[PDB]
Amino acid sequence: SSVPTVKLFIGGKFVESKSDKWIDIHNPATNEVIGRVPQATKAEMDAAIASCKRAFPAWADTSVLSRQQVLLRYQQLIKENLKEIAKLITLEQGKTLADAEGDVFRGLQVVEHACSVTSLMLPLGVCAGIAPFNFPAMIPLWMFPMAMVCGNTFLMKPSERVPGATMLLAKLLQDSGAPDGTLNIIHGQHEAVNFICDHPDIKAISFVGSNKAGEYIFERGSRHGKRVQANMGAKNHGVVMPDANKENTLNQLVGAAFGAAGQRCMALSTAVLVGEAKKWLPELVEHAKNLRVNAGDQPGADLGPLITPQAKERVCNLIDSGTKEGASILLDGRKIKVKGYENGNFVGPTIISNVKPNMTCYKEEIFGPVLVVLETETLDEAIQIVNNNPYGNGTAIFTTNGATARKYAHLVDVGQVGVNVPIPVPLPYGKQGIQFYTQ
Amino acid sequence: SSVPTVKLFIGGKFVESKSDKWIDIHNPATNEVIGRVPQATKAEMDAAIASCKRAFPAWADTSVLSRQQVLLRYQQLIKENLKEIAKLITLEQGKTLADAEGDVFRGLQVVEHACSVTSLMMGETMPSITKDMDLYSHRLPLGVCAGIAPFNFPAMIPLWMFPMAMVCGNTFLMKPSERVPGATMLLAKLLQDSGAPDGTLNIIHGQHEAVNFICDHPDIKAISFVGSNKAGEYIFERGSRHGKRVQANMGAKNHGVVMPDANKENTLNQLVGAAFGAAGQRCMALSTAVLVGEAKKWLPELVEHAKNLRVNAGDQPGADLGPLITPQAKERVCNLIDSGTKEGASILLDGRKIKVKGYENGNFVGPTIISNVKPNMTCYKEEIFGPVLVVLETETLDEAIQIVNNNPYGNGTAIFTTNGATARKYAHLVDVGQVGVNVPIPVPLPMFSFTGSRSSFRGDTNFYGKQGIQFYTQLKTITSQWKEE
Amino acid sequence: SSVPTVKLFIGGKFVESKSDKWIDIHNPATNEVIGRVPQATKAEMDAAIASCKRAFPAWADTSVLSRQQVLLRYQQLIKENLKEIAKLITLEQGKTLADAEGDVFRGLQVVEHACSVTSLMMGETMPSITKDMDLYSHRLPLGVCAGIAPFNFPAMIPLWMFPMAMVCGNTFLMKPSERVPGATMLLAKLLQDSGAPDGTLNIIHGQHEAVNFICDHPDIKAISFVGSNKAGEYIFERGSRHGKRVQANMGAKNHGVVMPDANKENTLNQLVGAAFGAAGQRCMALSTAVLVGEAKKWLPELVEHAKNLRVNAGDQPGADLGPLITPQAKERVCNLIDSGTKEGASILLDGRKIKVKGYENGNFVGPTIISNVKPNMTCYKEEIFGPVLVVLETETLDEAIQIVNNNPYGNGTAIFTTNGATARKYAHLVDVGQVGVNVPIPVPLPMFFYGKQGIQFYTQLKTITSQWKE
């Protein structure tokens, strides 16, 4: 009768959480309760830490070759259960099937890359990864393989509001024949983050979520002696030059901005229509309207709903504030009415114009199906505008001039630059993960 | 009238700064004023930063080959003027001629290794990953860098800090120790004569304000420091909080474990030397040892070997150990020895009574052997920074490992033993990165980076080598798809 | 029965061969026809080349990660189908089950090694060499490649050869042996099952005419071959003529040296296992040995150990050496043994008159040991390619080293001794790259082929200098 309760993988076995609190998780396409995620109590977290500590020596003594073979078996199991992970992601987040396939494929690629550490290879001890509360980012497949192959135990803190997607990964891991107790999964809220940061045994912490929470976790770990490699997915700015393919550029902008409800980290929400590119706004709005707003499981689901109704309320408030500041809303998704899924948190494609740095929308990470366009007079102005924002991870430029692309790539301080590509390196791990999880 | 004053290095040219406050540099062997250094004001520091910024683009657009050739020319000049720098160091810092020679030689070796950096600076590319899709990976410099060197190593620390930044395309602002800037000025003159373009290297002097400026200024992207723990932690908390990576090899305290299964002779000599070498004025020194088993009974031989070392001026023979750089350091070492004696540590050999002939006015202190030490003594808690050996006799090697782990400043620890199983067990349970076997102090070679560990070492990336390049170079990836329709 | 034919593999379909000329595959244990291999005609080879060329662009533009995934799935299928490949090899080539198992095992190991060429395939770049000027190099596939394998190792050699060309982004046209094509067809079927794009791999069967076509066609970029010296030299010369880059292991001759200061029993066992291993049909066979000092007086123990070898069919147990590849091979081996005997070389052991109960019809030849061999004798100059061991008598290490050097196409040998100075002397004086010490076969892995060198071979560099000033 009652919705199913998730059982945390602690001590090498899935055990029912005895906590009193149970955060109700609702399907974002219809706001129907699908499961409850429990807040890990002090006793459960202590038991998970003890399990990780007891599993650390065995997994460490395990030769690097054995760990690599175990990770290969896990990758094979993922390949077999790929559709299961896709369905889980589509159900929890309402994300389009194709986007779930892409996410699981990227996770598989990251796992296989982690497997290539055969010759590059001591472990630190117990490690933990903190996931964002926005969407079921595939951070487990991104970080857990590195800590594993390096010889460390991992305590993954996934997005409590989407536990099944991660629980299935731990199930497949246990099926991979790995030592029982190496991986532990705990859920909850800021309390669990505080616990993880305070505990001394944990040596490393990972976070890719919001800038505020990322800086908080970084400072807390530094004070409590933890190496944190937080890579928060801050805003992304795209400079659109006139000498570029209009149709392809517009399609890429629409997809990267509203794809998966624009909830992904590298969502290109911000754009810059420099050099008479302003004329492309009508076609952009037309392409946005052409997106089939529908549940991620049904066909024609170019963009899905928001993770939670609170997210929809936040997006509506942000759009209202932007409109109050004099920003013309050329496209309004607040009044979207999806047939058959009205109860869902669906928010149609939203486009904001004449936004400037003074606008709140520019100073706030929307993390939704909203796009903001800016205008400049020269390439140098766009470069300066992009540099002025300290919260930036990746940027893209669309142009057919080699000198323009060179100048943009060089003079721009962003670490990741894209030429004719909306989202370069969509992963934000990597080579530095070895040095991170080792010493 | 005016003792020789060291000048700044602004815009690739030496000039006298506005000296509103002097710092008296005294000869350690005689405590006589041999030089003065001015307090650089905001104006000179701003001018130096502006010169670094203006020189950054030209030096960055310069090919790495020409940079390596400039580094080779600088290394050649060093090799030519090696004895000059050796004498300057022996005069100003107080170490022996041989110590300064070895220092400059290690610096020259590091510079040579840095000269061969072509392959390391080469990026990566993955073309045709997808139809009309390409992936690039370019390494680029961070920008302006800074380096704060201690007084213990007037040459090694700069010859490790500034040449890497130079060859990597970055501009470097060196801040040498106000107590021993002469060697730094000589190295700067040599680098200039090498052929490096003006404006790349700049040098400012100061006591505490220069560090504050270097940390607060935003244009500086990287900072390097070596010295005491307090100053290192201060610089780190300032830099990292201001948005700039920092690497600090703070003051270390190496624990030399002795095993009964050793020859005892070469190891006793090496312990006596490292504990008292260069008056222990080193960022990493073997001023601490742990005796297990027969090592405890071996104390008389250790005391005898310590007595053998004679104290004399660095420029004269028989100078197995030199004087303290400053009289305040001598007073501090004396107070630490007195506290150790009071706290129950039996000092088998008191070095405070030794006096050098003809140089009594200098800060000379003989070899001090402090046995029966335990974690309750202050000599264990506080680093001595002097020719003192802190010996904690332990009945079992487990207690020795526990003590070495408790030490918050265990940058590098070594164990003397001919048995492989003992060294393996020691390295297993000891929480120190640089673990040496049958070696007084395991020092990193020019081929790999520093492998630091406890409070005595912190940073995002190591000083020099592969991780050095990683530190002084970024990694920007481009995903270009030059397709049509 | 109709003796089922060996159908070709062009494009994504195993098209049947319309050739009129056919060769009957005979089982070496009973000389019974078991299959018919076609002689591909001009039209079939042209169609195969067209398929390879059409598949080249898509396979090249595809991410290297996809090719690595395909190779991983192929290696997995091989792991699954190990027994089938082993049985097919034991049936066609006539080797023992253990021999085919080890063959497929080495093939799988090399496939795994090649699967990790991802980092090697990455290029290099130098940013801002001059103002607004950059430099970067792109590693690209050569185009269409071809392979010619010998009658030995019908699975190991292809698994070492074609996967490198595949991962490098090239298309491969594999020409299997005229005698043992079944294993290659099974490997191709397994690869196709791995999800590889159709048309990337093509297989054609035929006699020397096929080699002539492969060497003459211009679209072919690289060719690889392993086998006898004559065929290797011919293929290399023809490729150099038509401009094809050819890498061939022609120095199949191998010499063994045994000093009196060595482990007698172990050295003798290793020599008996290597020389007569798999009927001594492998190219890199230690069919020649130089006995120095007490090795002459040990030679009786070598003969005693060789007598212990049980000549029996591979399918049956206790099979140390199987039948020869063809009856003509047995005739040639017998003729060479008779010539050596006539030349004065004493036949301390004879196997020509061996008769395996129930398999006399086969080409079984027992262990043969020839002594008193001299450089002027034919048994030393001619490659035997069989279970025959030629033994030359020398007095000092210098004599054995000179005998080894006299054979320029002898890039393989080993020395048995206990003194390090003697081993260093042997390694230095001997002009051989692969020099073993107390090992029968010096790393069977041959080279001029694979590894990073294989990537370099199957790839090219394009230095790109671009200065987007304005």
Place this chain on the structure above:
Amino acid sequence: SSVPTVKLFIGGKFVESKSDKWIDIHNPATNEVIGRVPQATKAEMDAAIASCKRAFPAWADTSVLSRQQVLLRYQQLIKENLKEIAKLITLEQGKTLADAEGDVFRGLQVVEHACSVTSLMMGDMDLYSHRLPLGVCAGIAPFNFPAMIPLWMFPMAMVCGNTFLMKPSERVPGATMLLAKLLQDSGAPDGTLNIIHGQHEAVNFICDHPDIKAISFVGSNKAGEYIFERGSRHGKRVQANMGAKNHGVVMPDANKENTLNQLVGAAFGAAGQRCMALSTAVLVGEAKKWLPELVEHAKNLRVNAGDQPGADLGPLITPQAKERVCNLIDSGTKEGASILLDGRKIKVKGYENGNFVGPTIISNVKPNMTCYKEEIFGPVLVVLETETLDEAIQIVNNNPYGNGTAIFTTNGATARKYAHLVDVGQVGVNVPIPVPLPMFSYGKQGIQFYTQLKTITSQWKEE
């Protein structure tokens, strides 16, 4: 009275040659004899080979660090005496002082690169990867970059542990002789390097002698193929970067002024006497309209002796080359080639007796015409016309051989398409010379060539 003779180099001593055959070194600026190069006799070459063999073992036994320091001292000496090399080049080959200095700097950079190499030369399954040297090596130099040829071969051939027997350009031996003197002064063991002068007979001898394990050559395709065949016949290592024509594509969107300037500088630079010389160009689309301005820019070049200031291009090495280029231009005109600029009958005031040849430009050339087949190696730029990028790509690919190809354009799509579809080893974008010297078949390839590999494997735990 009698011009000086060119000395040999055997056993660490510049011994005199006893041959009777002597070639007069004519100054290309005035055709005045300034030297006499002899042809090495059989006995002299045998003595040189014997000295190389006797020096091989000692030079090889030394550690990589000793050879590295020797090469560093040699590089320092070169840097000190760069002006002497530049003057010798400008005197013998007639090359401009600026171009000679640039060539010497490029050679010094190559030497340094050879020095920057790491210990790579060295390289129960105990295994080793000792990469021993080959033996006695040799090299043949062309008339394009004679002073730099030895700077390519000596550093690597020596640091790898092999002795070298150089065959410098008989018409430009002074530069190589000065380089060898500097090398000897650097402190290298006597007999490590040897030098002999001669002609095709000498090349035959070198390729035939067995002690020669490896040989390197650059220049015309004919001599390249001949040496390759004759070396492969004797079973010895051979490597040669065959000279070939470079095709400089020019799109209409490219920078007209800059493109024309760079083309006129590269094609006519040093009278086109460079293996990387951009002797051919392809004007795509509206680029055809740039022929008049191209001819104007060519005319703007200042012809003068290499030793005089403002010399943009020098004369030809020998008058035979002048007659050859004149005959080639005549044949092209006869076949219907529409010439726009003719500098054959150029009379440089003060140096009329020299081999000076003014800039020459030719259009309407077709692949079947001799202008497109025969290599000019002179101040001649044949211009082709095309309608689309595909036509230019196909024309460039049809070339039987090519070392470098450049495409001037600002569109990244076109540049990438050209670089990917082209079949040339070196591709340049907005640069007529992709690489100062031919790197395509050294660095890594040179290390792999001048050395071998021995995979000593051993399982010696039982004894």
